[PDB]
Design a protein around this ligand. Structure first.
Ligand code: BEF
Ligand SMILES: [Mg+2]
Lengths: 11, 128
């Protein structure tokens, strides 16, 4: 949910 | 992106600014100035010509989130790239950065390789 949330954001 | 892109590195710890500036240099970005908090940053930005901001989150007077929101809502500076730096990737903090318009988000400490990766992601999205 962290590295995966980052991906979603293009971060 | 252009090697002469002018960066402002914002952090209340002088050693962290020196480190980021040194990493930028390692990547070929030599045009770098420093600011010690969000108020100092906005002062220095009035000089014009800045093309990229790298900002810490926790700073006195004006923090990095407050700085980012101000830049994003500013008539002249609204599209400036801003790479936000934090001490720990927490969901709440990442989501705040997203809502405010952070161009990128990186957790300290990081390598030049990580910095280049994050800068390149921003350049690609912005067509720089
Ligand atoms: F003070 Be910063 F958020 F590392
Ligand atoms: Mg700080």
């Amino acid at each position: 949910q962290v590295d995966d949330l980052l991906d979603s954001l293009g971060f | 992106a252009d090697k002469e892109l002018k960066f402002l590195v914002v952090d209340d710890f002088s050693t962290m600014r020196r480190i980021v500036r040194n990493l930028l240099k390692e990547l070929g970005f030599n045009n770098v100035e420093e600011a010690e908090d969000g108020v100092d940053a906005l002062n220095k930005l009035q000089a014009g010509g800045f093309g990229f901001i790298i900002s810490d989150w926790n700073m006195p007077n004006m923090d990095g989130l407050e700085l980012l929101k101000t830049i994003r809502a500013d008539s002249a500076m609204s599209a400036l790239p801003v790479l936000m730096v934090t001490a720990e990737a927490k969901k709440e903090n990442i989501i705040a950065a997203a809502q405010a318009g952070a161009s990128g988000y990186v957790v300290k400490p990081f390598t030049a390789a990580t910095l280049e990766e994050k800068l390149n992601k921003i350049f690609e999205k912005l067509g720089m």
